[model samples]
Target chain A: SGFRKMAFPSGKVEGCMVQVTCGTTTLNGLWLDDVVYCPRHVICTSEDMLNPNYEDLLIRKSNHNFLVQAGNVQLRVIGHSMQNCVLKLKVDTANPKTPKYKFVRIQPGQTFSVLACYNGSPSGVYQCAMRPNFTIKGSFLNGSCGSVGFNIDYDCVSFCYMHHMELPTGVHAGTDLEGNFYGPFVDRQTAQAAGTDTTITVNVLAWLYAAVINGDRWFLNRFTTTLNDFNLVAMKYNYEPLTQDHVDILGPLSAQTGIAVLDMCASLKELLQNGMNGRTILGSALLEDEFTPFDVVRQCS
Target chain B: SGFRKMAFPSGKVEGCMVQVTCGTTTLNGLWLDDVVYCPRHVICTSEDMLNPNYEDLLIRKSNHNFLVQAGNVQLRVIGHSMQNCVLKLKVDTANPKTPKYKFVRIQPGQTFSVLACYNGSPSGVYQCAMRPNFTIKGSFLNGSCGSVGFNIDYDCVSFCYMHHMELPTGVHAGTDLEGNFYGPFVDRQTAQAAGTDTTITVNVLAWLYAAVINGDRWFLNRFTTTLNDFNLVAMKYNYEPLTQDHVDILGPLSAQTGIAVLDMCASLKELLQNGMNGRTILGSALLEDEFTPFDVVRQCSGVT
Candidate 1:
């Protein structure tokens, strides 16, 4: 608390409001980012099929300039928006142009910190903001919610699953809030009021949960418990600079760094190649369900 | 049929045997060539499964030069043996060094193609020969299989998920056919006949489904179709160079080309990292009966 308080002071209905708007102009609340999850005990919601609700998903995220050591890739506090914020990191492939987010809620005013994998990926860069979950509700210098809004490819911050929404060049397809692919959609501004109009006669921007855009994957995937263990220790002390002793012990954690997810996404197809080569697959049709967390950490040191 | 026929003319029992030996060597039948595959629908027989009776793992090896357009990767013929064999290309991520095999019986005297992804991975080289399914018996000059045997890391024409068996260096570990990590296993050789006598009285080269290893995962994974299409088409026509129409449709295929059981061996931990990232994977927890062929093909062509 003392660390951030030096920069962002609390008061007024600034960063605390769910969202504020007038002529659909979106006055206060913000929408800096969104994320997706694969489902629990179930394979993912694929090619078709929508999730019923948020519970269908697990875990959550927001924003802040907070930092915590992730695997080879790590997240840290290095932002300007001094709003009540959160910080998280999502897994990505070797390519980092795409973005994803993972949230770790550090309560108790300031018992812990945040972080990301330090070297898990090949090479990359990601954005961090004082954005809130689903909506950016952080306060600015004068108790204002600095403007930042979006939908899902424009949704979740993870780079690897961008396939969940990414189409080839100049191809704009409709995307649901869960990252599912749809049709007749745009990647940039033409989709709304900020681009200028949400009018019935013109174009309109969708809200945070408006299932019309991408990012529909409905389960949480980033920020595993081991990471939390690291964060919890950071929180217990609420200080800068974590210990190397703990960092080294980090190997054997069931945590998913962006590289890990990228590998997961890439795994299934490869599994098929084996099949193509003539090995006999047993019962299941895919490898997605066959892989599990228990399996991942069952032996993590 | 027409293709492999020109390269690997059969009869006189050529290219049709497992590994044979003498002085503990693959004494007879020959063991020439190698190949690779990605796992999807099939569960590979691992380190200790014994593969029913045909030994289940007829792993063979050495070289050959062959060709076939496998996605971005291609296979062609140019070999070390003129005796009786055809070399073919398979797809790959880029590099082909580690060795794995793909043997589906494209009958009428193995008249069909026995291709495997050749170069999808990077940083190494590998050998491939269509010895036989569950056995390696391609012909060599001295009637001997030109010594091409392996370990998953030492196996595979590709190099991605070496079961992390891939960690380059002196850090050797024992591996089962399934890619499970095992004990005091030495990667640099200290193991046995395969690599040369282990200081310890350990496993001898168990060839093919050799249990002389240390990795294994039991969720029942490994093969998928579309490859079945190719194998089927081969079985149907038993020929060479398939039509481009069928080839282009190769998109959304069971053809990951260079990815396979390798990923299966490598996926669990990676998924957890994703799970740890906070994603909620299902209960029994993972992808298996999830993607249908329709869903598979649909994404490739870009529909809804």
Candidate 2:
């Protein structure tokens, strides 16, 4: 079996080690070079990940090795706290309290690749660094991977332009087993520093409203992320009709992206440009199919 | 940590065993005996569960044991497949293909307690058999647990009344660490058979429309589960208006549930009852916040 290392957290948290073994991989097994290590928190496993009783091995602080019989292995990082920093590594050992990673905040279509080591140890490597709206591919440099060598290729969404929208309520980001991205996370710094995915779980309404106020690309990403949920919330709260103020906030953003059209329920700027003015300059149309009805709301007005 | 035995799967798929250890339990640790075993498929752990690299142990097919230092312990079963059947066990081995368990189908708010054994082994036990909308509590019996035993008490929703509604797309059920139930499962049988959770993932539209057509209590549960998402979907597709036919289907259901009122976006029976008949009887109100707008849709209707 061949395995791709996902996330290997680096820290001095004494008793922390993660050992991952792959079982049947559509018959593609894991090789001896596969690695799984994260500081003291989170474990990144494979998609369609299934380990049917293999030899139990525990990774230690010093060195570790893992292999599968005949399956391809991928790593995934899951836990309540370490979800956001799946693709991040603690690069700065000097500031133990404040963790930093080798990350870039690129936009939607940008892509990059890297061979990240664990806790500064070249023995542990990440198959790919994770982020939303990006696809990751793990490639091997030599038969003896990990210590020997490996590189990961990533495409789409390598950058972020988020500022000060620390979503304290219902917002978060992560990927499914298939590696599909799902997130509207708070910000890069906090998420990276704490190795925590501050994806909201309790207050999505507050997050969305805050995004609308901040008016950044993240808002657009979040809009797409929770498109269906946003519609449901708007209907429940009677906020489906967009006000003129919302249109003003979203106009420049729509012009900037060119994809935030009314049809996608992504923006209300298109409605504003169409000659609909004043109170009627609502965002999501109540009866119109072409307009995204959940983007804006009709308040007391 | 005072640990609770959550789920123990009983099967003859040799080399299948589960060992669970609890750590730092909100300052409440485990006693001498805590148990963890699931068939070969899944393992249920505690909420707010964090085990900082304790000694490694594997549970064999025969006998197993576990315990925590101090803190309250609970169990959670998480996997892609076994999510729906969190509270179920394969009790019938007569037909390995056809697994069975001691289960009950009840409605919301109804609670019960039981001391269930694993594969007929009194040694293995489940603190509580899970279902959505219910709260579970694991209580100890005598000093020695597991083999000596413990009982689980469940409150709120212990019974299910789901039938024929196999939601294949965007539906599923389970609880978080807090043990709050969340589900709109296909049915008890499918979920129980494979020790799997049949929550939908791809097509929510189909599930919602099917729920409207089936008009069962599961729909209400599902509605509440994805209320926000439903609103967003409605906005994207422009399905915020209720049709007359939809009102008719939901009227009796609303009357039966009583709480499925317009304010909750639960049902449009209120609008129907108020003589808002014919074309105007659309379900979720577009301009009205009281009605659930995502419940119904408007096509090219009779015009001009």
Candidate 3:
């Protein structure tokens, strides 16, 4: 089945934990004193990851953990005396016309959320936005008021960076299966304050599954990552004791898959330039003569 | 009532659609005469886009006519295969891992659709693709051996340039929607033949709505278009007639929204240096003391 404890090594060390189950098991750990490894267990279950059901588990985890859902970057209607209010979420562009939006109805003093943009999360790292101006609907108006909303004043002085202010979720966001609360976030500070993770571990695993390792070799030599990167690439996935470099280096998957694991590689680069940003990927050799267009692995077992 | 037709104009000049609604009767072609407009005829009567109910009509229209769900770019998995087959759509990126997909099932030789990509028919004017290598799972084998699809040899002679390939739905391949169809697309032959632009119109509309007039006026003098410019701009859309230029020219939107309307403007600019390209858009003026940070319209009536 798996390893047991009691091969309990002698002494305690920093960064390692120990346990005894009837005191008779064997596996590797920092073994401060022969730890009966648990989930509090170090390393991955080598047998499963490459299996069929694994990829799905990986993606589900990534979404539930690290990603922000749609409209994660939006704003609450602040500072205005709006009544009998009708609003249209508008972004400025060439055509001044706007499709009229309305209140199921709003009174003079109240507020609501306006989703101006979305799809991807804020990388939970950057953002900036000011609300948009809207048009009032009534007494014979056909999509009027001319190209309205959000007048930008350069002198008003603001960061035109990131996307927009992180939107409030109103409820605690994703929590791990064990139920560690995390969410009700408007920015990184809140997200950090809200303890959330095993779920995050799941997501990166999942994201990598869906985005990179699949059957298709989409990325090929198009990307690269390196040793000790899991710390940064898998954000917040730390201190576990694998002790082995156990395939510690990362890059393109099998030449047949050509999948480039991007986020894991990029995030590490985003935090520290180390072996991440610039390093020649010793591109794998493609058997140019074996196939045309692609190498061909037409069937899956 | 919706239209039925008439000769309308003498010159057959392009980009013009004529409609006449005498009080109530509706849509028609050509108006050799000037024109008349009216909308008393009743339709959906009440509902705002922000209303939960209002969102429904949008869903319907976005689906049937303009918008493409799943962002709207995709394929119908029309190639090969048989019984009990399943599929997991994915993309390749920097990481080398994947998600396990489900339901290992399908019919022999029968076809099925895999909603692969999206959002408004790719503006219908541009497109490019050469499907990737896919693994097949089955009791018996079919489609095997890897890395085979799309043999690219620039020497075969080519158009060279444009980031317009359909980036797979894999990864965060959402890689900025605007960066796709709009960039690498130019020429009528490509757009019209390439096949792609309704939600595209929406995107262009959004880009303009957020970049041009809202102030920072990103397109202000920073851009230029010419050569059958207006006709080209209005080519896909014509004549319910706002030709007065009515300030109605589709430019960039909210100056601060200066994302980049690369394709639309450049294509027109590409065709001709005439009344289209190089011509300045005589930008507009905003109230010097109106507000800061943003023009500030603040407040929506609903949250749906």
Candidate 4:
């Protein structure tokens, strides 16, 4: 359960709302916050703001909240898109438990807008957060007509890289449960722009490795900014919670800095080279001794 | 029909009177004069001659022949065997109009004697001829096998060499419906005994050509008379008579004495080389085109 806020030119305009939409079907909750009026001010309500379904949430020009004065106002709306247009607002209790959120399915040409409230403030920042239901399922954030500020961290980079490594060649990794590893990197940009959490950092590593192996210098020039943007976003969040298993899997070469991922790649490349050489040297003697010409004849015959 | 008369130790024997026997059926229209018998003969019936099918009047056995002698009478049964027991006759009827005669088709384990009738003259050449009706077939005497002897002219060698020139590396001209041109030279003894018509001629050609192409000097010593003894019986007769089309196809190569059947190996090798070169050139072009930023964008947009 997260929130999104949008700001306009007017200061703290109340009752001014914008329609929020999700690429997925159902939403967990939606909240509107005015950052310019009060820096730490939190006014949470699940009344008209809560639209359980992504489809049912009406998006109209009238729903857009523009401040009357020439000041700045920020509005934030947060929700999870579960199935269709169904959006639900998460309720707060004495003991806050982890709320089960669903993903919103995205369709082509579908657009959603958030209500911007401005009363008297000058300048403020608007932010949005979405929690995905499954690791395979991605969350998308839509921006207004202007440019939006974004930042990502190395954790997100590692997560995306690991996912890319796990994907098979010639398949779409982000679209399905398994990542598409060797497929073209172009699709990664589209997924990233749509707020779909993708690992473009691994794609960079893959291209770099390909350039080394095939001696193709062209891959260096072909690199994109999607991974860099995601890294910036992750850095802005700055959450580093690791389990014992994480340390075990990414130990040896993994450091606190971004260079750890690069070290891990080098280590993996060495391991692969050693394995290939060992196979060549050992040959068929590595097989069981009981193997006979009769077996070969039986198989062929 | 040409008639051949061979005078044996027992009496004068003619080639045409020979009866060709299958299993239960007998076909008596085969001509023996045209057939050049293998010296090592074998007695076989018509059904045994064409084992799998009666329609195939092919001589199968090439190794040995059957010779019978009782008192003053001598009978030489020349034919082939099927699997080991069934005996089939080798008949040559290159001229279909006058069908050739070869041997007598006798029942399994049947015993008979060859009768010899000598005139007042001490020895005279006698040629045998046959005339068959719906039920019975009989034989009569003609004159001789040949006035002097037989010799091969080496007429097909030119066409055989021409086919060899057309072939690529490993493949060479083989004898199927096609005739062989190159020869290792049949041994004089086997050639004299077996005569010129059987597989001795073809085996000699195959062995000789293999040696020449491989450039093995030892093959001349290795093949020797051994190669000449190995023979193959022709299952069907094929006559390569001259025609206007034949002249047109081989007109330029007629002067070449070493011509052979068409060479497919060389042609196929050339085709494959050209195909591989074309693919390499095209692939390089594609890679060059892929370097452009516009090309990359087009590929990403799935426009190409």
Best by TM-score: 3
Clash count for candidate 1 is 165
What TM-scores do the predictions have? Answer: 0.17, 0.20, 0.22, 0.13
lDDT tens digits, residue span A182-228, model 3: 22322122222322212122222222332233332232333455535
User: Ranking by TM-score, best first?
Assistant: 3, 2, 1, 4
lDDT tens digits, residues B1-304, model 4? 0000111111112122233222332222112233322211123242343333422433432323332222233334344433221233343233222222222332111111111111111111111111010010011111110111111111111110011110111111111012222222111112211112211122123222222232322212211222111111112221112223333433233223232312211221232234222222211111111011221121122220
- Per-residue lDDT for A26-133 in model 2, tens only? 111111112222211122234211331111212321121222111122233221112232212222112222222222443222222222112222221221222222
Chain B TM-score in candidate 3, rounded to 2 decimals? 0.18
TM-score of 2: 0.20
Candidate 1 lDDT over residue span A190-249, tens digit each: 332111111110000011011111122222223322433433433333222223332332
lDDT of the structure predicted as candidate 1: 0.21
Go through the candidates in order and give each one's DockQ: 0.01, 0.01, 0.01, 0.00
Q: Show model 4 residue runs off by greater than 4 Å.
A: A1-244, A247-301, B1-294, B297-304
Alpha-carbon RMSD of each model: 27.8, 24.4, 27.9, 37.9
- Per-prediction interface RMSD in Å: 30.4, 26.4, 30.7, 52.2
> How much lDDT does candidate 4 score?
0.21
Winner on TM-score (1 vs 3): 3
